[PDB]
Enzyme design. Structure first.
Site, PDB file in Angstrom:
ATOM      1  N   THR A  93      -4.683  -4.986   1.112  1.00 26.02           N
ATOM      2  CA  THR A  93      -3.884  -3.769   1.251  1.00 26.02           C
ATOM      3  C   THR A  93      -4.590  -2.734   2.116  1.00 26.02           C
ATOM      4  O   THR A  93      -3.935  -1.985   2.846  1.00 26.02           O
ATOM      5  CB  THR A  93      -3.477  -3.200  -0.109  1.00 26.02           C
ATOM      6  OG1 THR A  93      -4.619  -2.696  -0.796  1.00 26.02           O
ATOM      7  CG2 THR A  93      -2.804  -4.278  -0.930  1.00 26.02           C
ATOM      8  N   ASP A  94      -5.932  -2.700   2.063  1.00 31.56           N
ATOM      9  CA  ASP A  94      -6.700  -1.810   2.929  1.00 31.56           C
ATOM     10  C   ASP A  94      -6.427  -2.112   4.394  1.00 31.56           C
ATOM     11  O   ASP A  94      -6.351  -1.191   5.223  1.00 31.56           O
ATOM     12  CB  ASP A  94      -8.192  -2.003   2.637  1.00 31.56           C
ATOM     13  CG  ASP A  94      -9.063  -1.029   3.372  1.00 31.56           C
ATOM     14  OD1 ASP A  94      -9.213   0.092   2.863  1.00 31.56           O
ATOM     15  OD2 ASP A  94      -9.603  -1.372   4.452  1.00 31.56           O
ATOM     16  N   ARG A 141      28.540  31.963 -11.650  1.00 31.48           N
ATOM     17  CA  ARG A 141      27.162  31.612 -11.948  1.00 31.48           C
ATOM     18  C   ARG A 141      26.335  31.517 -10.670  1.00 31.48           C
ATOM     19  O   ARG A 141      26.874  31.240  -9.588  1.00 31.48           O
ATOM     20  CB  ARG A 141      27.100  30.253 -12.663  1.00 31.48           C
ATOM     21  CG  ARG A 141      27.688  29.054 -11.873  1.00 31.48           C
ATOM     22  CD  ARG A 141      27.573  27.733 -12.663  1.00 31.48           C
ATOM     23  NE  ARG A 141      28.034  26.598 -11.862  1.00 31.48           N
ATOM     24  CZ  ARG A 141      27.909  25.317 -12.208  1.00 31.48           C
ATOM     25  NH1 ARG A 141      27.354  25.000 -13.376  1.00 31.48           N
ATOM     26  NH2 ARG A 141      28.354  24.361 -11.404  1.00 31.48           N
ATOM     27  N   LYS A 190       0.834  -1.181   0.000  1.00 33.04           N
ATOM     28  CA  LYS A 190       0.000   0.000   0.000  1.00 33.04           C
ATOM     29  C   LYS A 190       0.878   1.244   0.000  1.00 33.04           C
ATOM     30  O   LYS A 190       1.853   1.323   0.747  1.00 33.04           O
ATOM     31  CB  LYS A 190      -0.840  -0.005   1.266  1.00 33.04           C
ATOM     32  CG  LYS A 190      -2.055   0.909   1.199  1.00 33.04           C
ATOM     33  CD  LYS A 190      -3.181   0.276   0.407  1.00 33.04           C
ATOM     34  CE  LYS A 190      -4.500   0.988   0.591  1.00 33.04           C
ATOM     35  NZ  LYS A 190      -5.535   0.250  -0.217  1.00 33.04           N
ATOM     36  N   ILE A 219      28.912  21.083  -9.102  1.00 30.28           N
ATOM     37  CA  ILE A 219      28.070  20.439  -8.089  1.00 30.28           C
ATOM     38  C   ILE A 219      28.782  19.220  -7.505  1.00 30.28           C
ATOM     39  O   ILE A 219      28.703  18.952  -6.294  1.00 30.28           O
ATOM     40  CB  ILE A 219      26.704  20.085  -8.697  1.00 30.28           C
ATOM     41  CG1 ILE A 219      26.028  21.384  -9.133  1.00 30.28           C
ATOM     42  CG2 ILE A 219      25.919  19.262  -7.717  1.00 30.28           C
ATOM     43  CD1 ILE A 219      24.800  21.179  -9.981  1.00 30.28           C
ATOM     44  N   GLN A 220      29.506  18.481  -8.359  1.00 35.20           N
ATOM     45  CA  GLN A 220      30.289  17.326  -7.919  1.00 35.20           C
ATOM     46  C   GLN A 220      31.213  17.708  -6.766  1.00 35.20           C
ATOM     47  O   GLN A 220      31.277  17.009  -5.744  1.00 35.20           O
ATOM     48  CB  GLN A 220      31.115  16.759  -9.088  1.00 35.20           C
ATOM     49  CG  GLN A 220      30.336  16.094 -10.233  1.00 35.20           C
ATOM     50  CD  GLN A 220      29.929  17.055 -11.346  1.00 35.20           C
ATOM     51  OE1 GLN A 220      29.501  18.187 -11.090  1.00 35.20           O
ATOM     52  NE2 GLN A 220      29.994  16.584 -12.580  1.00 35.20           N
ATOM     53  N   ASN A 276      20.882  20.033 -11.218  1.00 38.71           N
ATOM     54  CA  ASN A 276      21.298  21.396 -11.535  1.00 38.71           C
ATOM     55  C   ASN A 276      20.105  22.080 -12.220  1.00 38.71           C
ATOM     56  O   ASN A 276      19.677  21.646 -13.298  1.00 38.71           O
ATOM     57  CB  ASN A 276      22.470  21.386 -12.516  1.00 38.71           C
ATOM     58  CG  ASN A 276      23.048  22.774 -12.755  1.00 38.71           C
ATOM     59  OD1 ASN A 276      22.426  23.797 -12.512  1.00 38.71           O
ATOM     60  ND2 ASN A 276      24.240  22.803 -13.287  1.00 38.71           N
ATOM     61  N   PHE A 285      32.082  27.222 -13.143  1.00 38.08           N
ATOM     62  CA  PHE A 285      32.135  25.965 -13.879  1.00 38.08           C
ATOM     63  C   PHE A 285      32.963  26.215 -15.134  1.00 38.08           C
ATOM     64  O   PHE A 285      32.458  26.777 -16.115  1.00 38.08           O
ATOM     65  CB  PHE A 285      30.762  25.391 -14.210  1.00 38.08           C
ATOM     66  CG  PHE A 285      30.824  23.970 -14.741  1.00 38.08           C
ATOM     67  CD1 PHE A 285      31.405  22.942 -13.992  1.00 38.08           C
ATOM     68  CD2 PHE A 285      30.329  23.667 -16.013  1.00 38.08           C
ATOM     69  CE1 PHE A 285      31.474  21.641 -14.490  1.00 38.08           C
ATOM     70  CE2 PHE A 285      30.412  22.373 -16.520  1.00 38.08           C
ATOM     71  CZ  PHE A 285      30.975  21.355 -15.751  1.00 38.08           C
TER      72      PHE A 285
HETATM   73  O1  LIG Z   1      28.287  21.607 -11.765  1.00 36.01           O
HETATM   74  C1  LIG Z   1      28.143  21.241 -12.885  1.00 36.01           C
HETATM   75  N1  LIG Z   1      28.482  19.958 -13.188  1.00 36.01           N
HETATM   76  C2  LIG Z   1      28.337  19.476 -14.425  1.00 36.01           C
HETATM   77  O2  LIG Z   1      28.664  18.355 -14.645  1.00 36.01           O
HETATM   78  C3  LIG Z   1      27.840  20.306 -15.400  1.00 36.01           C
HETATM   79  N2  LIG Z   1      27.560  20.110 -16.713  1.00 36.01           N
HETATM   80  N3  LIG Z   1      27.056  21.254 -17.211  1.00 36.01           N
HETATM   81  N4  LIG Z   1      27.020  22.174 -16.210  1.00 36.01           N
HETATM   82  C4  LIG Z   1      27.480  21.589 -15.092  1.00 36.01           C
HETATM   83  N5  LIG Z   1      27.613  22.065 -13.830  1.00 36.01           N
HETATM   84  O1  LIG Z   2      -6.990  -6.951  -6.202  1.00 39.52           O
HETATM   85  C1  LIG Z   2      -6.762  -6.638  -5.079  1.00 39.52           C
HETATM   86  N1  LIG Z   2      -5.639  -7.108  -4.445  1.00 39.52           N
HETATM   87  C2  LIG Z   2      -5.382  -6.792  -3.182  1.00 39.52           C
HETATM   88  O2  LIG Z   2      -4.379  -7.195  -2.657  1.00 39.52           O
HETATM   89  C3  LIG Z   2      -6.266  -5.970  -2.512  1.00 39.52           C
HETATM   90  N2  LIG Z   2      -6.272  -5.462  -1.259  1.00 39.52           N
HETATM   91  N3  LIG Z   2      -7.372  -4.694  -1.134  1.00 39.52           N
HETATM   92  N4  LIG Z   2      -8.052  -4.727  -2.305  1.00 39.52           N
HETATM   93  C4  LIG Z   2      -7.371  -5.499  -3.160  1.00 39.52           C
HETATM   94  N5  LIG Z   2      -7.635  -5.830  -4.431  1.00 39.52           N
END
Ligand SMILES: O=c1[nH]c(=O)c2nn[nH]c2[nH]1
Ligand SMILES: O=c1[nH]c(=O)c2nn[nH]c2[nH]1
Ligand SMILES: O=c1[nH]c(=O)c2nn[nH]c2[nH]1
Ligand SMILES: O=c1[nH]c(=O)c2nn[nH]c2[nH]1
Ligand code: NA
Ligand code: NA
Ligand code: NA
Ligand code: NA
Lengths: 301, 301, 302, 302
Positions: C66-67, C194, C6, C242-243, C269, C177
């Site tokens: 699941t209910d 930048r 769920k 960023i790396q 980014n 960069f």
């Molecule tokens: O920080 C950055 N890393 C990247 O790899 C990159 N590629 N384009 N701009 C970028 N800026």
């Molecule tokens: O098809 C269903 N599978 C389930 O496991 C389920 N649980 N609640 N309703 C359901 N319906």
């Protein structure tokens, strides 16, 4: 302003009465909806002078709980005997004003939650049981109803629409001849792959025609979608502005019962990366930066 | 862990070489792709011991800029002469390792950006120019390639997939017989409208078959989609677990060149609101609270 | 692979036992957590070979709905007497395996749903409210735990990891960069100054899994303290990429928390594109870039 | 309707003129803005009857490309010498109408992109960094402005509005919702003590549009001060509904800022559902509700 309500009221109905006998147009195969599955997302807003003290004094005596408005909508989807979202909104509105005399005004928005057919098998056919939830375009409807002083109810505003249509035409579009000054850096483009998002909304001359009770007069969002794609294909576009006017003119020619068509369009055209590929008419593009152009325009009958 | 790369590398190619002659199966009409528009979102990750000092010392001497990796991908989409995402990933990978001898490992993900045909008109036909951007299901591909000590290149992992499939079957599904104890409140349901999200991934016995060079051996995501919808229609489902096993078995029967199929499924079934509507087989449902069940399962050939 | 569970099990608890008694570091004033409001989003995955026929035959006999797993998690948040997400996961995992003998493995993820203090005027002065909190959509703590049942019915933790997710930091100057490969694929100009904008996800593993629970809080490593190390090192460093930055952040974390075995970084980014370089009479203007984003994945070990 | 424009025009400016000289209120310590980093997302809409043939004939002669409108906004952020988003919008609007004589109306929306201060250790102590900022996804200020060109070529502001968007507040106790209509559509139980969770969008209009610009800052109403009034009133009030609460917030705003003409609220109810009522030996457990949300829209005037 003073109103309150409930949003995101999802309601899914199986086996609504089918919509059948819609008059067809040449751009679209649409003739109706089977309504095995009918999904809608409703927003309800209500107003009235008698709501004041719910705000100014914390008096809830005349507050219909928003949770109750949700129950009202979902129960009414079970009892609705019509065939369209527009008609469902009317049914909800009339029933709500009839039930709650202290409300003077109700506004409703309904958005289709669309589903598509799927294949099942000795031959593939459309399944009557299994459907695909679609996150693409969908129909919409809007309705405002009021209670007058003489206690009659009246629809003050009705509008239908199509939302979320995203169309790209790979060639056959230009954007040239616009203002070139100190602020202009955009190159003229005689052949761009114009990518437009479209929201299209229409109003009827006669509100009755929106309900679908007489399907001959109903204008379906599916037909509007198909007109838009046909006109886009057919037109050497000169701008989005030019395209949407032509779409609106075609819609109003096909549907004389319509009074107006309104467009909200956005430009999402890609940036070109590779202009020429050896031995090919192909090209490579990529997504643009966020800023998007938009246009808004009404065409009247 | 030590790697770096570029994500969300969108690239759209017009007029890729068409995919044709794919062996068909009975569940699907698919035979190929016209490739008027070919959109892909690529993620690239590269690694190698010689990258260490870019981290430990801030030495950029052996840093291919991530922006350059984006240019590499977009230029290679312009020069690719094949017909599938899987083959495009191989082309990018082999070219990148050949270009940059200090890289020991490349991992690529490609996600289709899908487009659908539209109608244009004296008769409606599919347009060769205007396409609809789809936000529904899409094909995927994954590839890892390494440089060995004897300087040969080798694909260490390949997987294809379909993502974002959302299917609802209105009847013909049960969920009964599960554990009832102090923690159980879920009622047994002999006829629920099971709504499943599906991500399905497959691996080939022979990596060559993924490229599409011999289309007879290529397994298309479209065909996988159509098997899933057919099996769902055909099966009185007893749980999602039961359904996905049956889908996997059908896939592997139709495609003996496949080694395995993997499923990630989620349960999004609606809550019932109205159980009985007078004079109708219909019912009303609504969206559930957020928590969703999920299942993960591999079927092997 | 065979498992099920769920996801998006949200649970909000009021008045959890407060976290106090923590060991401070120079880079952070963090001194504990009040726990008036404690929110968590839990994902639970379970497996075991006895689940096979639920897939191959549609036999639900050994299926915990699941209910019901959602009910289990929510009820155990009500009874939990500890002070950390990591401890909550252990409480759930141990309890679930004890309840369900046919389950061999459980995996849990918990993500904090963070809230911030607000202030109110009452009885003459403005002070921190004990009642009103602001939901935050910024960074949040995370935890991961895997537990297994052995043949003799003992339970063992097989993997544990803590983290900080969603940290978005922009340094307006003091980053370069330059010196990267310039070849037929290179169009990026060298940039001596930048406004580097990074997204950081930082995860840590302890030498002794017990130190993650908080029962002896002086040994706990708080996501808040990791956040504060990250912002301090970013300020202090003339970054070369960023790396370069994330290695230095990792070194500082491991120096400040000798009880940690390693720290893992996923960075992205998101640096803006320059529009206006010179403004008359020290500012500039920038805008959002195209969607593609560089990223880095890197572990530093003790 | 006939207009066109550009949306999602992000612009980030360093070292804008600081906002200082503001007038304080009891509910807020706000004392100004440093403006080391100033981010804004701008939407611009323009109209005029001379644009008709760009739609009806495909004649681009009088079309300012939307891309050029983006350039215009970004360049004017570089030259702007004021201290508020409201003033920036006026600067853009006046400049745009002066440049483009065939445009009769311009509408602008600006949304703050907010950043928060971080801290670093340097030269012996931990202090606020002048270089490193945390991007926030929480609440933010907004501004709206409409300007028109008259027949005599003078320009008039025709509407101005300021606001605060995205405020999400939860009060764990001291809220009731009882006494509402109980009929055939009602299944909601009366609740004497609920953990009310509200989303608030608050907008204000000034009696004199000049006071919105900040040129005399003592007359400016800051979104930060509105935020702090909202949190204080929510704490102070035994709420009877969201309707009740927002009226009281609006009253307090208008009492504290007599230069305002009105305040408008859009609120949503996102209160969690109760799972566990009684915990042995004062807490409870709650979870996320189904999607439907109540909402309210309400103006208070001076
Ligand atoms: O920080 C950055 N890393 C990247 O790899 C990159 N590629 N384009 N701009 C970028 N800026
Ligand atoms: O098809 C269903 N599978 C389930 O496991 C389920 N649980 N609640 N309703 C359901 N319906
Ligand atoms: O169709 C377009 N209309 C416009 O107004 C515009 N501006 N830039 N590009 C554009 N394309
Ligand atoms: O504060 C509230 N106002 C309402 O109108 C309402 N309706 N349901 N719950 C509610 N809570
Ligand atoms: Na027709
Ligand atoms: Na076939
Ligand atoms: Na303390
Ligand atoms: Na000050």
């Amino acid at each position: 302003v003073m109103y309150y309500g409930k949003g995101d009221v999802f309601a899914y109905r199986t086996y609504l009465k089918p919509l059948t006998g819609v008059r067809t147009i040449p751009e679209s195969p649409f003739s109706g909806r089977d309504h095995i599955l009918f999904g809608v997302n409703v927003k309800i807003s209500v107003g009235g002078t008698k709501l004041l003290t719910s705000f100014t004094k914390g008096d809830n005596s005349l507050v219909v709980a928003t949770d109750s408005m949700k129950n009202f909508i979902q129960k009414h989807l079970a009892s609705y005997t019509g065939t369209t979202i527009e008609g469902f909104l009317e049914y909800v509105a009339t029933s709500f004003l009839k039930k709650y005399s202290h409300i003077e005004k109700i506004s409703l928005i309904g958005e289709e939650i669309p589903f598509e057919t799927t294949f099942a098998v000795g031959n593939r056919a459309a399944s009557e049981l299994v459907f695909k939830k679609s996150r693409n375009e969908y129909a919409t409807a809007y309705l405002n109803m009021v209670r007058n002083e003489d206690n009659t109810l009246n629809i003050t505003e009705q509008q239908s629409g199509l939302a979320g249509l995203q169309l790209i035409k790979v060639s056959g579009n230009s954007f040239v001849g616009f203002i070139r000054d100190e602020y202009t850096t955009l190159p003229e483009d005689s052949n761009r792959p114009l990518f437009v998002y479209l929201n299209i909304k229409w109003k009827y001359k006669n509100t009755e025609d929106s309900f679908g009770t007489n399907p001959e007069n109903y204008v379906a969002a599916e037909q509007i979608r198909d007109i838009a794609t046909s006109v886009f294909h057919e037109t050497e576009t000169l701008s989005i502005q030019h395209l949407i006017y032509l779409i609106g003119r075609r819609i109003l020619e096909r549907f004389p019962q319509l009074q107006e068509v309104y467009f909200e369009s956005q430009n999402h055209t890609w940036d070109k990366i590779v202009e020429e590929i050896p031995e090919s008419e192909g090209k490579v593009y990529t997504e643009p930066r966020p800023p998007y152009g938009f246009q808004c325009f009404t065409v009247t009958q």
